[PDB]
Amino acid sequence: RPDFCLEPPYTGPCKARIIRYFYNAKAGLCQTFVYGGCRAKRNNFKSAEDCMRTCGGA
């Protein structure tokens, strides 16, 4: 799978509480995390479907 899928979820410097999805490699599935609202890394999706399609592997 893509390299960014293996990186830990990135909240970023902004201080909003935006719920996003990230691929948890250890768990083998996409989960939710708190995104701050800006400067998102690639392991950050607006839906579980998009997260699994992109980071699911296979």
């Binding site: 909240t11 902004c14 201080k15 909003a16 509480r17 708190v34 800006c38 400067r39």
Partner: protein, 223 residues
């Protein structure tokens, strides 16, 4: 708010919660039809909740009003975070009372050393997460621009001000963005960004409201 305390019930009557399903940002009521928040808190649909203390319990003093107009600063940069300010016009004028009140805009820029009150329902932990039911408060000073610049090399503009402590321990955090920084009864800052929360040498960075009084007034008058 990390390292703060639970605000006295309804002691920050200008504090509002921005909600789009769940609480996601704060804001400040500046007049009976307008709220000022952070531009990075933008969402196409926003419900403003006023008179809140416990955001997870219907207490009886709350007012729920949807955003009719959402206007981000025209020069907002989503990467540098310069001009991180946004105005929200309420669909209907709110009823002002002891628990729902307006906060004054700055008469001029407050100098470094000025003590202020920061508030919000953001994460209370620097490591891990704890979303508080009750509104949190934090008394903190505006820091010298040189110290802010030293903590965030090459990332601080004239439209930003650091508020907090160089030693860390107390700070605003995720869920607090858009919220108020009030000093001597005037809204001098808006919770914006920072590296982590309550970390040493990285105090929170806030939108310097005193640079936007004319924009705010002109925008309200035109909308």
């Amino acid at each position: 708010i990390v390292g703060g305390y639970t605000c006295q019930e309804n002691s920050v009557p200008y504090q509002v919660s921005l909600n789009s399903g769940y609480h996601f940002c704060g804001g400040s009521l500046i007049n009976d039809q307008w709220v000022v928040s952070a531009a990075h808190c933008y969402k196409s649909r926003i419900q403003v909740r006023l008179g809140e203390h416990n955001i997870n319990v219907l207490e009886g003093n709350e007012q729920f009003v949807n955003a009719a107009k959402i206007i981000k600063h025209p020069n907002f940069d989503r990467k540098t975070l310069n001009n991180d300010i946004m105005l929200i016009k309420l669909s209907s004028p709110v009823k002002l009372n002891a628990r729902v009140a307006t906060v004054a805009l700055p008469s001029s820029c407050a100098p470094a050393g000025t003590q202020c009150l920061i508030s919000g329902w953001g994460n209370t932990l620097s490591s891990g997460v704890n979303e508080p039911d009750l509104l949190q408060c934090l008394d903190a000073p505006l820091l010298p621009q040189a110290d802010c610049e030293a903590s965030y090399p090459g990332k601080i503009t004239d439209n930003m001000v650091c508020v907090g402590f160089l030693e860390g321990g107390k700070d605003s955090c995720q869920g607090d963005a858009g919220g108020p920084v009030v000093c001597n009864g005037e809204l001098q800052g808006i919770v914006s960004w920072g590296y982590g929360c309550a970390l040493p040498d990285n105090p929170g960075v806030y939108t310097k409201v005193c640079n936007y009084v004319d924009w705010i007034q002109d925008t309200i008058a035109a909308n």
